[PDB]
Design an enzyme around this catalytic site. Structure first.
Site, PDB file in Angstrom:
ATOM      1  CE1 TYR A   1      -1.547   2.882  39.610  1.00  0.00           C
ATOM      2  CE2 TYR A   1      -3.635   1.601  39.959  1.00  0.00           C
ATOM      3  CZ  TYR A   1      -2.499   1.831  39.071  1.00  0.00           C
ATOM      4  OH  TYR A   1      -2.087   1.078  38.200  1.00  0.00           O
TER       5      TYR A   1
ATOM      6  CB  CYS B   1       2.395  -3.619  41.482  1.00  0.00           C
ATOM      7  SG  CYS B   1       1.743  -2.326  40.359  1.00  0.00           S
TER       8      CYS B   1
ATOM      9  CD  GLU C   1      -2.993  -1.278   1.928  1.00  0.00           C
ATOM     10  OE1 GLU C   1      -3.539  -2.444   1.898  1.00  0.00           O
ATOM     11  OE2 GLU C   1      -3.058  -0.770   3.143  1.00  0.00           O
ATOM     12  N   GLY C   2       1.705   1.463  -0.932  1.00  0.00           N
ATOM     13  CA  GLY C   2       2.520   2.391  -1.207  1.00  0.00           C
ATOM     14  C   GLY C   2       3.454   2.943  -0.119  1.00  0.00           C
TER      15      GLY C   2
ATOM     16  CG  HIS D   1       5.928  -1.158  43.192  1.00  0.00           C
ATOM     17  ND1 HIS D   1       5.605  -0.833  44.508  1.00  0.00           N
ATOM     18  CD2 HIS D   1       4.858  -1.587  42.809  1.00  0.00           C
ATOM     19  CE1 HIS D   1       4.383  -1.182  44.793  1.00  0.00           C
ATOM     20  NE2 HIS D   1       3.900  -1.486  43.611  1.00  0.00           N
TER      21      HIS D   1
END
Length: 266
Positions: A177, A213, A94-95, A195
């Site tokens: 949060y 987390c 597509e070009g 963490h």
């Protein structure tokens, strides 16, 4: 051969990992275009990957401008990978044409695999099959649980702020949060990090309190951040949650070889 190396109108490719990087056993080779790619099969054909020791691998697309390449299994430590993105002037459909060529060489460090088991609420870190760290942890509470599956360690931060609006959940809302955190190691594009969480030390080892987390103690988070590298593995088992989408960004290993292999070129 008018090449450019990958440091860590037309379409530019960008290849990860970067030239010379040492990466964990789950790091997939990534080629990402700045434009959508009508002719996937073409783009695939223009990408040569050599590995030593040789290992079979295969392309799967995460979206319309990003292809990924990996073995059936995790890399063996030691492997050197060279990537040749021979895309300059190539017909991408597509070009659209490849603006340039691109190269990268990288290598595989130690096997580092951290398993978080919701049955024990411990995240156990294994280097070359041996337990070197055992970290009580606290994950998504039932109403916002942590997805099961295999996550590839992405980037790392000494401090940042996770803002739930980034994931289309307003800060003001019940799962909202905007949180400052230290020693944040990202493991999914959907926002899951390992963490520092001094606010859940009491709970780490006992009860899931987080939005998703893996909360760990401050020194264990720092330890994670010091010893972990892109491509290392966190595996989450036995939560009440689902499975981490294969097309997350760091979800690759959750697609099975067979679906992956078959590819999605069209």
């Amino acid at each position: 051969r008018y090449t450019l190396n990958a440091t860590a109108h037309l379409t530019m490719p960008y290849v990860m990992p970067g030239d010379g990087e040492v990466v964990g056993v789950g790091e997939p080779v990534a080629i990402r275009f700045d434009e959508n790619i009508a002719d996937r099969g073409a783009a695939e054909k223009a990408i040569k990957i050599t590995t030593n020791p040789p290992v079979e691998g295969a392309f799967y697309w995460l979206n319309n401008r990003e292809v990924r390449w990996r073995p059936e299994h995790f890399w063996k430590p030691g492997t050197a990978v060279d990537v040749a993105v021979n895309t300059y002037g190539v017909d991408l459909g597509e070009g659209m044409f490849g603006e340039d060529n691109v190269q990268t060489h990288f290598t595989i460090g130690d096997e580092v695999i951290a398993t978080a088991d919701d049955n024990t609420k411990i995240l156990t870190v294994r280097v070359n099959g041996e337990v070197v760290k055992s970290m009580p942890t606290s994950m998504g509470k039932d109403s916002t649980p942590t997805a099961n599956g295999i996550y590839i360690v992405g980037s790392r931060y000494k401090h940042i702020i996770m803002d739930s609006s980034t994931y289309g959940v307003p800060v003001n809302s019940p799962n909202g949060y905007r949180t400052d955190v230290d020693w944040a190691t990202q493991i999914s594009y959907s926002g899951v990090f390992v963490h520092s969480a001094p606010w859940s030390v009491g709970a780490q080892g006992h009860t899931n309190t987080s939005h998703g987390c893996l909360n760990v103690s401050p020194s264990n988070a720092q330890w994670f951040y010091d010893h972990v590298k892109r491509g290392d593995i966190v595996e989450v088992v036995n939560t009440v949650g689902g499975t981490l989408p294969g097309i997350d960004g760091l979800g690759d290993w959750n697609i099975p070889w067979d679906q992956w292999r078959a590819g999605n070129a069209k």
